């Protein structure tokens, strides 16, 4: 269920019931680690540095004075949160490294109470207007001055000796402490992301559809089938090493090849078919010498020369792609996939895969393309079926590239060998 307000609160930075009274006030504003993970799209780092500097993981800094007026500050906060979260989440989770002072400040821009709905839609209310005594979601908050029923978590309560700086810098070299509140907010959210996502994928947690997930995923799998099918025809590899496949599902089930599975974290139910292995170039550059390695979004330090690779570019701006640890990003599409920083040095043994369509299937505005590898294109004019399938494939390839995925292949790959298959 929820985080019982009885639960003790480690005071080195007492219970939650006590703490809420001290702060100046949905059984609890604080939620479990498990619930925070489910609502990762809602995470906003929050820190405070007598005029107060308010800092958020969006890099925004606001100063209020008893700076700027509180009535102006509280409007800017609702606007910023509404803008950041309206397409991501139905809520906000403030991510804290709790020093005491940030919890004190919430009374000035936060209101709590029972769960309520937007005056304009069926969505849960995230904002309140003192001026009109009305409740809004993130989409309908244009006037509004108070954050309504925000959730929060203190990362210190997960058992960290040392300060924020020392623990953040253990796993991340990308966020330097320029002595301001936003930098602490950024570092704190980074640390929480490290603790919750970097170690492994949680297959059991699924995230709602918020954009083009289904089309992106369908297109990626079409391209995966085409490319691995094509490579196996072209170079006739006796064995495929599928590195980072924890479910033991072949993308080409018909393929005449020995299909070997590996993963750092194989699913229990298929572990019998999958070798536990953590691939690093430094520890396996002399291994998997036979056949071809498939790294379908298996984001290792460096790929060996005999690879087929799909990799997501962490720099891509998308509602699916959240800021991550150490130049990486957290790609939330069905599940949450922490991705290491896109680094070109990883692809040094490979080349970019060129576009093509290949079909050995039976034949059935005329198409003139060297990239349509079909029986009919070999003989002058392309058949209506293969011309149609070509256009559907080009659509899928374009969907995959715009979604931020890139394709790499062993340097000796060529479509010449696919022309020979006819
Ligand atoms: C968006 C997505 C990807 S990804 O595009 O490869 N990726 C995102 C980018 C990224 N960054 N760091 C890791 C990843 C993985 C994989 C899956 C998935 O659910 N995979 C289960 C799965 C297997 F694990 C194995 C075979 C299988 O066939 C059919 C499903 C299946 N999803 C929903
Ligand atoms: N260095 C590494 N060596 C082996 N497996 C790794 C790895 N880094 C990540 N993984 C595994 O890579 C997978 C990425 S998600 C699943 C991707 C899979 N190829 C697909 O088509 O869906 C996870 O199962 C993860 O445990
Ligand atoms: Zn609304
Ligand atoms: Zn960081
Ligand atoms: Zn044809």
mmCIF file of C-alpha atoms in Angstrom, residues 29 32 34 36 51 82 106 145 158 161 177 184 192 240-241 259 291 325 338 389 404 419:
data_model
loop_
_atom_site.group_PDB
_atom_site.id
_atom_site.type_symbol
_atom_site.label_atom_id
_atom_site.label_comp_id
_atom_site.label_asym_id
_atom_site.label_seq_id
_atom_site.Cartn_x
_atom_site.Cartn_y
_atom_site.Cartn_z
ATOM 1 C CA UNK A 29 3.211 13.412 1.388
ATOM 2 C CA UNK A 32 8.048 4.507 -0.657
ATOM 3 C CA UNK A 34 8.831 1.401 -4.826
ATOM 4 C CA UNK A 36 8.732 6.741 -6.445
ATOM 5 C CA UNK A 51 15.882 35.589 1.639
ATOM 6 C CA UNK A 82 3.071 22.507 -15.352
ATOM 7 C CA UNK A 106 7.032 24.158 1.183
ATOM 8 C CA UNK A 145 -0.348 30.023 -7.545
ATOM 9 C CA UNK A 158 17.891 5.044 1.922
ATOM 10 C CA UNK A 161 26.837 7.960 5.145
ATOM 11 C CA UNK A 177 28.813 21.668 -7.579
ATOM 12 C CA UNK A 184 22.058 20.129 -5.360
ATOM 13 C CA UNK A 192 18.201 8.638 -6.888
ATOM 14 C CA UNK A 240 24.830 -15.692 -33.418
ATOM 15 C CA UNK A 241 25.797 -14.438 -29.891
ATOM 16 C CA UNK A 259 21.340 -18.838 -31.528
ATOM 17 C CA UNK A 291 29.964 -16.049 -36.070
ATOM 18 C CA UNK A 325 23.268 9.588 -14.342
ATOM 19 C CA UNK A 338 19.013 3.609 -17.964
ATOM 20 C CA UNK A 389 6.434 -3.327 -48.497
ATOM 21 C CA UNK A 404 16.902 8.381 -31.665
ATOM 22 C CA UNK A 419 22.033 -9.621 -54.593
#
